[PDB]
Amino acid sequence: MHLNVGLRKIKETVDQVEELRRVNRSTALLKSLSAERERWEKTSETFKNQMSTIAGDCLLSAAFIAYAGYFDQQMRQNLFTTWSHHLQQANIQFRTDIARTEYLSNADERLRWQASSLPADDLCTENAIMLKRFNRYPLIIDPSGQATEFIMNEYKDRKITRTSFLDDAFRKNLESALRFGNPLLVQDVESYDPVLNPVLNREVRRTGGRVLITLGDQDIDLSPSFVIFLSTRDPTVEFPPDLCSRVTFVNFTVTRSSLQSQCLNEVLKAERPDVDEKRSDLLKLQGEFQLRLRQLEKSLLQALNEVKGRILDDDTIITTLENLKREAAEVTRKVEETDIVMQEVETVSQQYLPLSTACSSIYFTMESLKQIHFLYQYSLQFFLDIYHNVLYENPNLKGVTDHTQRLSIITKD
């Protein structure tokens, strides 16, 4: 609607310039305005193309959020490919370039997640997305347990509390959370308590000014702020179909592919932070720089709709048009930077890939070595600490600067 109001004001300016003509100075403003109006019409074109994309993309994102919360990376990708293939068969338009990990997520929320020790990865980013927006309370399957730390850090501001099903005071803690709307996390859900069946079913009772949910033989005033998380560290635990339908699944199981991507990200951030910054900024070239572009465009719209007859000041319009053109040219140059990213940043990724593949193989080997002897139990925290002491606080790297040499020394260590 803002764009249409601007179009009305631009037609008003066209009328003003035609009145001025009724003379080359007015003609120069007229032809400059036509070129700027040309920019406006093409901007209207892409958003009308954005309509089909938003409809189809909402469909695909919804199907990915409600479903696919239990499958691993390969199955998620396969299901996404099948859905997109059928949509293409059905002539439904959907933006192929966009990724599910970013369409449903915001940059500030992403950096809050990173500050909350999110294990940055495709699987983990999607999992955090499904944790942010939901209609049924989630079931976090974290054999590694990093999801528990992520939840504690993210919901620390709202004072989330630790409580398990085996705890006798679990009922008291749940009652307190329902009374005060405090978030709750349950770390053991294999021994499920069916007292949560009404809460999960959201069997609310909006009598008078109170929203009540019947717990056992008692009625408790539900709070909107209340949210409950259920965890099960067992990867092979089974639940009855009632629970499987009542909760949404968000598994943090670390598949070798997921571990490979996580390790590649860790090394790309640890070594060569410039490419990591540009790849993080690869969405800030369309983000932070495009954020400044949108600020410049909105300031241009402000100046254009508060004209009030600015006969004294007319250089502002031309300056704003030139600045918006400069921002767009920077965005295109950063698009070519993304082209070189598919030339060199992806080459940086593929040069750091053999290390990540070996690291995923090493952790799989450790988890397999758990078999031959009951004493050989290792965790993801242990391997990650090995990793962090290999990269950070490594004496074999103080006087080492060459990138390939750094990679070789890092592999050996």
User: Can you give the length of the chain in residues?
Assistant: 413
Question: Which technique?
Answer: cryo-EM
Exposed e or buried b per residue across 145-161, where buried means at least 16 C-beta atoms within 10 angstroms of its C-beta:
bbbbbbbebbbeeeebe
Smallest CA-to-CA distance from 122 within 80, 66, 185, 62 is with 80
Overall resolution, Å:
3.5
Query: 122-132 and 146-154 are packed helices; what angle lies between their axes, rounded to 10 degrees?
Result: 40
DSSP string, 347-359: HHHHHHHHHHHHH
How far is it, in rounded angstroms, from Cα 146 to Cα 116? 11
How far is it, in rounded angstroms, from Cα 293 to Cα 306? 20
Asked whether the beta carbons of 100 and 61 are under 8 A apart, the reply is: yes
Angle at 281 between CA 339 and CA 317, to 5 degrees: 90
The side-by-side arrangement of strands in the sheet containing 205-207 is: 205-207, 210-215, 218-221
| Long-range contacts at 364-368 (CB < 8 A, ≥ 24 apart) | 364/256, 364/259
DSSP string, 107-147: HHHHHHHHHTT---SHHHHHHHHHHHS-SS-EEEE-SS-HH
Residue type, 296: L
How far is it, in rounded angstroms, from Cα 279 to Cα 288? 13
Exposed e or buried b per residue across 311-322, where buried means at least 16 C-beta atoms within 10 angstroms of its C-beta:
eeeeeebeebbe
DSSP secondary structure letter of residue 232: B
CA–CA distances in Å: residue 363 to residues 105, 261, 377: 30, 13, 12
Asked whether the beta carbons of 65 and 133 are under 8 A apart, the reply is: yes
Smallest CA-to-CA distance from 118 within 262, 281, 260 is with 262
Terminal Cα-to-Cα distance of the chain (whole angstroms): 59
Asked whether the beta carbons of 57 and 98 are under 8 A apart, the reply is: yes
How far is it, in rounded angstroms, from Cα 157 to Cα 193? 27
Take residue 349 and report the two structure tokens written for it.
């990724």
Displacement of CA 97 from its chain's centroid (Å) = 15
How far is it, in rounded angstroms, from Cα 180 to Cα 360? 43
How far is it, in rounded angstroms, from Cα 134 to Cα 403? 43
The side-by-side arrangement of strands in the sheet containing 228-231 is: 161-163, 184-186, 228-231, 138-141, 248-251
Residues 6+ apart with CB under 8 A from 90: none
CA–CA distances in Å: residue 327 to residues 285, 296, 321, 323, 337: 10, 9, 10, 6, 15
Residues 6+ apart with CB under 8 A from 105: 125, 128, 129, 132
Strand, coil or helix: what is 219? strand
CA–CA distances in Å: residue 335 to residues 265, 322, 332: 22, 20, 5
How far is it, in rounded angstroms, from Cα 153 to Cα 396? 34
Take residue 310 and report the two structure tokens written for it.
């600015």
